[PDB]
RNA sequence: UUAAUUGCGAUAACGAACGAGACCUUAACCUACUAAAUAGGGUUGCUGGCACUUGCCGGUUGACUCUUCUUAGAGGGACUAUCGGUUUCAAGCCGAUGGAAGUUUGAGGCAAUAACAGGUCUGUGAUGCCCUUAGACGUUCUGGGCCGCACGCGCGCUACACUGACGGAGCCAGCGAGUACAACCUUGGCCGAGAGGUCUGGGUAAUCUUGUGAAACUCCGUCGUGCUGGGGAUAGAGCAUUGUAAUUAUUGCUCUUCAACGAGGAAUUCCUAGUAAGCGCAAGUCAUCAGCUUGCGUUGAUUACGUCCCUGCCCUUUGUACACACC
């Protein structure tokens, strides 16, 4: 039952919309990017945010997506 | 080559050392044997009515050899299991103290156990030599 | 100095620390040779790495294991893991890569726990239940 | 440092308990050090909450 | 309590000579031997089942397969 | 290891201290079937009489029976301790005895009727047939049978 | 066979040819095959084991119970009552004694006897409660091969238990008797009797 | 109230030998580590004492 | 006679029954693999099992 | 679709808030860092024994050195990561692989709006009102009771035995706790058969009890289907401990009588993995007393991995003569 509630999805959406040139396909690089360019309080939320950011990046690479 | 008691299976070592101590006339048994439960937890005396004290002495001597040094009350904790407390849950009941004290003094007389400075009793050089000797006896007895 | 390493293997609350050295094929647990592991019916469990690998693989290797904590069979599984991991770590450190991977293939194809510590451990108890997940009886009337 | 306590002040209600606890950390330190500087160190840098104790052991 | 079992003594508490020839004659031809197998034939009480079973390890009348306590596993000598 | 056991001598029934006892049980557990004698006391008595522990009661000889009987009527003569005895300190005459088959039940009955006559709360509780040792009776002993 | 010299002297029979794993160093897992084709892949003879005792996580996913060694599943089903529930070393000893006993009687390598008894004693058609309260009906249905294995183990151990209860024979001996009788179709076996009687009920309630 | 008889009963031990230190009550006392506070007042003042709900 | 036949499931059609404990599958015979039935099973199944049937003309009916 | 008003979305709805999630504690994994005579290890001393080959098993608060395990700080680590299926191809689901870990990673702690005439004046020097306030419903002292017993019911404990009881022998934990203005945890040495007694010595605690050498368990024997060596209730006598005080047996110990009990009807309870269950230990009650509870660990499974059939819960639609709401 992993659904990635509001916060992670909205944060990843804003991350992509403001930092697409810097984001990559790899989870670890985007994790370091999330650490540096955004102040996520905890680290589990940081990891969820980076994971969904990578997923959205992969979807974008496949093609153009809504939202 | 060389052999220690750690190199021989336990139960065989206690059995053979008890047999050897029973064969020789040393290690006097207290006159109160045959009458004692050996523990409050137990409800009958040992099935082997005569000679069980020799087995207890053998086990005690092996235990002192293996460990650092052991007193009497610690042996009380070691022996003795669960008492059938009638219709109440079983607990742990320490074994009889007089029996283990007599074992320790008898082993002192045979010279196999020495009083340790840190309290309790440790093994002595002569008794430890006897212990490894009987361990070898058992080991080459096996094959 | 003598080529020597130290590894460990754990069970629920058991812990076996094994020192491996370049010896003469000498395997002792708690100062006693491996053939006298107490439960005597899980004895084959502790020979398992020996027979899976083959004794000739470590004939000039000596083994010293101190196992503490946990009950009997937990200790036995701890010694199993300690011996296996010690063999693998020694082969990695001083022997060769291929030998180590061959040992890992022989091991992990049989009782994966032999190199990987078990993750299952007891569940904390809770009030209103005499067990960790059980519950008291209900009256209802 | 743990205490279990029944929540209900009057025994009525489903059996519910709770566990309160602190943790005490000790972190002792010993020095093979000269006299006056050590005592000055002990008499300075004190934070409420943490309790400092000094044993000469000489 | 309810003695509906209606069991008899049904066990030779003491061995008798003819029963000794019986134990010896089918000491072989009992291709598997154990304490329960011995008492199954009504000829042993059960405590002397162990006695007779242990005595048969005298001239190799039967061979042991495993001598664990709480039971025994014996086969005919071949 | 085994013996034919001399067909024609192994007893099957015995009368020790005017109670019938089947002899085929092990000696100690056969002796246990007499009132006032339990497994511990019978075991010690058989030990003192030097008769084999693992022997059957129906095969031991006659003077063995008499020596056993003599041992278990004046125990203090045969180094049976002051303790381990059935009735010690004997509050009629202060001499630690050991009650036996008929003597045990009889003397228990005299002690019971003494407690009845003494008008002790324990005695009147015994006379009524209720619990004596001070346990709750709201929920226990709720039928006589 | 090439006894390896070491400072610790492992017994020769434990060193002989040990690329030949046996169950209790007595029975070969090779030569043992499943006669029935339906119950293959639900009886684990493929993987050799030196003991019928493994701390395997055989209850995490749905179907890993099949991958557990079949002798191990028999052991785990022996340790079934309140008085003896956690005791498994006792179950391992009982199974070892039963295997030796079965080796004695009709040698027929006892693992094959175990497998054949499990094959025979598992029902192939069963009933389910379908009646809508007012009318009580049992509707005949088919059983999964995994449930066939589970049920066969269940009745085998249950019959051994009820035979051993307040009886002279040891649990190992009664289990060996049940396994031997279920190796054939001998109706004297309790497990095979329950199998036949349940199947004929299911036939009576098509 | 003869001093020989008034409050003469010993109170070295038992239920009533010690009180609540909060309420003076003798029921539901916590003697662990010498807290000597009854359970309810302990639940009230645990956070001030240093005790917290943690798991 | 002993007309015991085998049938390998090719698909599982959900779980049926008032109890919720029985399932329904589509089995295809080991012989004549173009001949299939729908059959009720009582226990855990998945794509690959081989059921044993004492019938061949029976077809599964949803249990209510 | 999700465990989720969890999301993908469609849209007279747009933006938001609480709840859920997030969050903390705990359990993992750390041969990566910092370190350690209140934790361990190696080498070497000084020794003991056996082997005789240089080796094995030991002892020492003698030295040097190290942190793998034991600790605890800062950190790392998993985010369903990669891949394959399936999905208005979106949310997501399923499988395999790599992993320590892939059920929200397991277990919890807090936990919304509204409400109950739910419980507590008997926890409070929280308390309104009413009552009493001198031979008192205040306070204290003595003794009794809260434990009675023709009877019903609710948590449990011990059992009905062979997978066992009883003897010996093996010998394995993790949570704790522990004395000062008082007298706690007790080692060790002597006594006693035991409970216990006495003499000394540690420990205000990773130092001492303590490696809590616990039970179940394991090995070898006795028993042998007999209400029997199962079961240990009910009693008789005696020996001790705490206590100002033990009778209405406080509790422990020794000998004996050994009862009901043959796996328990209708009915009904708890529980899907280190789970149930078996087994005990610690702590809270404690001057003495648990068959209790809260925690902890040992051995450790069968069967699911689904459904709305019984009992209920959530959302939607519908009907209602119900709103103290189908009691
Ligand atoms: Mg013992
Ligand atoms: Mg019992
Ligand atoms: Mg439990
Ligand atoms: Mg480390
Ligand atoms: Mg995909
Ligand atoms: Mg959670
Ligand atoms: Mg009300
Ligand atoms: Mg008032
Ligand atoms: Mg009351
Ligand atoms: Mg309750
Ligand atoms: Mg035992
Ligand atoms: Mg410990
Ligand atoms: Mg113990
Ligand atoms: Mg009896
Ligand atoms: Mg008994
Ligand atoms: Mg039990
Ligand atoms: Mg209570
Ligand atoms: Mg479910
Ligand atoms: Mg109205
Ligand atoms: Mg109506």
Curated annotation (Swiss-Prot), chain C:
Ribosomal protein found in the keyword field: yes
Descriptive protein name: Small ribosomal subunit protein uS9
InterPro entries, A to Z: Ribosomal_Su5_D2-typ_SF (IPR020568), Ribosomal_uS9 (IPR000754), Ribosomal_uS9_CS (IPR020574), Ribsml_uS5_D2-typ_fold_subgr (IPR014721)
PANTHER family the record matches: RIBOSOMAL PROTEIN S16, RIBOSOMAL PROTEIN S9
Compositionally skewed regions (Basic residues) per UniProt: 132-141
One of the protein's GO biological processes: maturation of SSU-rRNA from tricistronic rRNA transcript (SSU-rRNA, 5.8S rRNA, LSU-rRNA)
Family as reported in the entry's similarity comment: Belongs to the universal ribosomal protein uS9 family.
GO MF annotations in UniProt: RNA binding; structural constituent of ribosome
Pfam families the record matches: Ribosomal_S9 (PF00380)
Region (Disordered): 121-141
GO cellular component: cytosolic small ribosomal subunit
Keywords: Ribonucleoprotein, Ribosomal protein
Key word Ribonucleoprotein present: yes
UniProtKB/Swiss-Prot annotation, chain H:
The entry's keywords: Ribonucleoprotein, Ribosomal protein
Gene Ontology CC annotation, any one: cytosolic small ribosomal subunit
Gene Ontology terms: biological process: cytoplasmic translation
Gene Ontology molecular functions: structural constituent of ribosome; zinc ion binding
Classification via Gene3D superfamilies: 30s Ribosomal Protein S14, Chain N
Classification via Pfam families: Ribosomal_S14
InterPro entries: Ribosomal_uS14, RIbosomal_uS14_euk_arc, Ribosomal_uS14_sf
Family designation: Belongs to the universal ribosomal protein uS14 family.
Record PANTHER family: 40S RIBOSOMAL PROTEIN S29
Annotated protein name in UniProt: Small ribosomal subunit protein uS14
Lineage start: Eukaryota, Fungi, Dikarya, Ascomycota, Saccharomycotina
Gene: RPS29
Curated annotation (Swiss-Prot), chain I:
GO BP terms, alphabetized: maturation of SSU-rRNA; ribosomal small subunit assembly; translation
GO MF annotations, alphabetized: structural constituent of ribosome
Cited Pfam families: Ribosomal_S28e
Keyword match Aminoacyl-tRNA synthetase: no
The organism's place on the tree of life at top rank: Eukaryota
Cysteines engaged in disulfide bonds, as pairs: none
UniProt keyword annotations, A-Z: Ribonucleoprotein, Ribosomal protein
Any single Gene Ontology cellular-component annotation: cytosolic small ribosomal subunit
InterPro entries: NA-bd_OB-fold (IPR012340), Ribosomal_eS28 (IPR000289), Ribosomal_eS28_CS (IPR028626)
Cited PANTHER family: 40S RIBOSOMAL PROTEIN S28 (PTHR10769), SMALL RIBOSOMAL SUBUNIT PROTEIN ES28 (PTHR10769:SF3)
Family label: Belongs to the eukaryotic ribosomal protein eS28 family.
Designated name of the protein: Small ribosomal subunit protein eS28
Organism for this UniProt entry: Kluyveromyces lactis (strain ATCC 8585 / CBS 2359 / DSM 70799 / NBRC 1267 / NRRL Y-1140 / WM37)
Upper classification of the organism: Eukaryota, Fungi, Dikarya, Ascomycota, Saccharomycotina
């Amino acid at each position: 039952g992993r659904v990635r509630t509001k916060t992670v999805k909205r944060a990843s959406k804003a991350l992509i919309e403001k930092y697409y040139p810097k984001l990559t396909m790899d989870f670890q690089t985007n994790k370091r990017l999330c650490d540096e360019i955004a102040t996520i309080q905890s680290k589990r939320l940081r990891n969820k945010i980076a994971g969904y950011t990578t997923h959205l990046m992969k979807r974008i690479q496949k093609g153009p997506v809504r939202g | 080559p060389g052999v220690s008691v750690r190199d021989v299976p336990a139960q065989d070592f206690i059995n053979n050392y008890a047999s050897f101590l029973q064969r020789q006339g040393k290690l006097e048994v207290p006159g109160y044997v045959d009458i004692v439960k050996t523990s409050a937890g137990n409800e009958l005396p040992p099935q082997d009515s005569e000679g069980w004290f020799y087995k207890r002495a053998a086990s005690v001597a092996r235990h002192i050899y293996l460990r650092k040094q052991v007193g009497v009350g610690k042996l009380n904790k070691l022996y003795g299991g669960a008492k059938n407390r009638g219709v109440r849950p079983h607990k742990h009941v320490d074994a009889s103290g007089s029996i283990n004290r007599k074992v320790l003094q008898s082993l002192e007389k045979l010279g196999v156990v020495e009083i340790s400075p840190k309290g309790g009793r440790r093994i002595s050089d002569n008794g430890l030599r006897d212990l490894d000797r009987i361990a070898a006896a058992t080991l080459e007895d096996e094959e | 100095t003598v080529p020597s390493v130290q590894t460990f293997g754990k069970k629920k609350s058991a812990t076996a620390v094994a020192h491996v050295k370049a010896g003469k094929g000498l395997i002792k647990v708690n100062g006693s040779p491996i053939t006298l592991v107490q439960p005597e019916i899980l004895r084959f469990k502790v020979y398992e790495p020996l027979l899976l690998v083959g004794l000739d693989k470590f004939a000039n290797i000596d083994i010293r294991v101190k196992v503490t904590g946990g009950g009997h069979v937990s200790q036995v599984y701890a010694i199993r893991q300690a011996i296996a991991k010690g063999l693998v770590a020694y082969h990695q450190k001083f022997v060769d890569e291929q030998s180590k991977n061959e040992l890992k293939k022989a091991f992990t194809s049989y009782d994966r726990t032999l190199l990987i510590a078990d993750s299952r451990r007891p569940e904390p108890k809770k009030f209103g239940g005499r067990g960790a997940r059980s519950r008291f009886q209900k009256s209802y009337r | 440092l743990k205490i279990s306590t029944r929540k209900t002040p009057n025994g009525e209600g489903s059996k519910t308990w709770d566990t309160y606890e602190m943790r005490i950390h000790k972190r002792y330190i010993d020095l093979e050090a000269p006299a006056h500087i050590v005592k000055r160190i002990t008499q300075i840098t004190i934070e409420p909450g943490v309790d400092v104790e000094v044993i000469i052991a000489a | 309590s309810k003695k509906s079992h209606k069991d008899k003594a049904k066990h030779a508490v003491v061995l008798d000579q003819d029963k000794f020839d019986r134990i010896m004659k089918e000491a072989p031809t009992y291709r598997y031997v154990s304490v329960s197998v011995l008492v199954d034939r009504f000829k042993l009480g059960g405590s002397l089942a162990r006695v007779a079973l242990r005595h048969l390890e005298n001239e190799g009348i039967i061979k042991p397969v495993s001598k664990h306590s709480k039971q025994a596993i014996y086969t005919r000598a071949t | 290891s085994l013996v034919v056991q001399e067909q024609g001598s192994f007893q099957h029934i015995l009368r020790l201290l005017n109670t019938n006892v089947d002899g085929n049980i092990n000696v100690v557990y056969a002796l246990t079937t007499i009132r006032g004698v339990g497994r511990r006391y019978a075991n010690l008595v058989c030990k003192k009489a030097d008769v084999d522990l693992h022997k059957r009661a129906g095969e031991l000889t006659q003077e063995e029976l008499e020596r056993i009987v003599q041992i278990m009527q004046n125990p203090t003569h045969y180094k049976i301790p002051a303790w381990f005895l059935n009735r010690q300190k004997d509050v009629n005459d202060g001499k630690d005895y050991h009650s036996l088959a008929n003597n045990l039940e009889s003397k228990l009955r005299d002690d019971l009727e003494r407690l009845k006559k003494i008008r002790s709360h324990r005695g009147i509780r015994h006379f009524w047939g209720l619990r004596v040792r001070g346990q709750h009776t709201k929920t226990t002993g709720r039928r006589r049978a | 066979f090439v006894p390896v010299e070491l400072a610790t002297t492992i017994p020769v029979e434990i060193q002989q040819a040990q690329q030949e794993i046996k169950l209790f160093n007595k029975w070969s897992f090779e030569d043992v095959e499943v006669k029935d084709a339906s119950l293959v892949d639900y009886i684990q003879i493929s993987k050799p084991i030196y003991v019928a005792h493994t701390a395997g996580r055989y209850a995490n996913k749905r179907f890993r119970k099949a991958q557990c060694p079949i002798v191990e599943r028999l052991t785990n089903s022996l340790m079934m009552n309140g008085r003896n529930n956690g005791k498994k070393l006792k179950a391992v000893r009982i199974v070892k004694h039963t295997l030796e006993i079965i080796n004695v009687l009709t040698d027929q390598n006892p693992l094959q006897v175990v497998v054949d008894a499990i094959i025979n004693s598992g029902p192939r058609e069963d009933t389910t409660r379908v009646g809508g309260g007012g009318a009580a009906r049992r509707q005949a249905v088919d059983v999964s091969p995994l449930r066939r294995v589970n049920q066969s183990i269940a009745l085998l151990t249950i019959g051994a238990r009820e035979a051993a209860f307040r009886n002279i024979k040891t649990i190992a001996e009664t289990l060996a008797e049940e396994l031997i009788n279920a190796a054939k179709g001998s109706s004297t076996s309790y497990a095979i009797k329950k199998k036949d009687e349940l199947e004929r009920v299911a036939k009576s309630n098509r | 109230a003869h001093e020989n008889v008034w409050y003469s009963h010993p109170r070295k031990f038992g239920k009533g030998s010690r009180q609540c230190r909060i309420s003076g009550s003798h029921s539901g006392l916590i003697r662990k580590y010498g807290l000597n506070i009854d359970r309810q007042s302990f639940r009230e003042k645990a956070n001030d004492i240093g005790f917290y709900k943690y798991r | 006679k002993t007309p015991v036949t085998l049938a390998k499931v090719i698909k599982v059609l959900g779980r049926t029954g008032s109890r919720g404990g029985v399932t329904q599958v589509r089995v295809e015979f080991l012989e004549d693999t173009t001949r299939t039935i729908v059959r009720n099973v009582k226990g855990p199944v998945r794509e690959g099992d081989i059921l044993v049937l004492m019938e061949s003309e029976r077809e599964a009916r949803r249990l209510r």
